[PDB]
Amino acid sequence: SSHAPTEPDIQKDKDDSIIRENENIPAPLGTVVQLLFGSNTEYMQKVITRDKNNVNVETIPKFTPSLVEGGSRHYEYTKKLNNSIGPKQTKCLLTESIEHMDINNYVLVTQTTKTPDVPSGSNFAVESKIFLFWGQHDTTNMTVITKINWTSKSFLKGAIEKGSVEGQKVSVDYMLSELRDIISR
Questions:
Q1: 17-184, which class in CATH?
Q2: Pairing between β-strand 72-80 and β-strand 17-25 as defined by DSSP bridges
Q3: 26 preceded by a cis bond (ω within 30 of 0)
Q4: 62 close to 98: Cβ distance less than 8 angstroms
Q5: Do β-strands 124-134 and 17-25 pair in parallel, antiparallel, or remain unpaired?
Q6: What is the Cα Rg of the chain in Å?
Q7: CB of 47 within 8 A of CB of 56?
Q8: What are the structural domain ranges in the chain?
Q9: DSSP states of 41-102 as a string?
Q10: CA-CA distance, 51 to 183, in Å (whole number)?
Q11: How many other CB atoms are there within 10 angstroms of residue 61's CB atom?
C-alpha cells in the first residue's frame, strides 16, 4: 500500500548548486504538490511571510492554464535587506513553471527570482529547480538545485552567487518548516 520511493531525474549542469537534498516531508507526493502549488495558495503565501524580511506579499495566483505540465504563475513581494544604507529592500519577482509532473515518479517546478534593486540586480536572475519525489512510507522528499542566469556578467559575480545560495537555503528551510507544520497541526 505504501508507494515505492522514487528517483528524481536531475539533469546535471556545471553551474548548478545544491540548496537542499532529500529533505523529507511526512505526507504523500500529491498532497505536498497541492500544498505548495495547488488551488489554495495561502500555504505558499505563508511560506513566504514566515520570513519577516518578506513584506508586501500579494495574493499568490493559482497555476494557469491549469496545474499541469506547462502551467505557470507569476507573483511578487518585497524583501528587506540592509537596515539603513542602500539598498534597504528589493522587489522580488517570482515566476514558477511546471516542468514535469508525474505523481508516480517526480514533479519538477522551476522557480525563477528577479531582484531589480540589489547591486547588479539588472544583470541576473536566480533559477531554482524544486524536485518533489517519493520517500519511504508514503512520504515526500524535496531536492532544490539553484543556478544564476547571468544576462550580463557582473564584477560582483562571486559575492552574488554566494549570497544567493545562502538566501535560497533560508527560503527552502522556511518552505520545509511550514510544510512540516501544516502536516502536524
A1: alpha beta
A2: unpaired
A3: no
A4: no
A5: unpaired
A6: 16
A7: no
A8: 17-184
A9: THHHHHHHHTSTTEES-PPPPPPBS-SSTT-EEEEEEEEE--SSSSPSEEEEEEEEEEEEE-
A10: 19
A11: 13
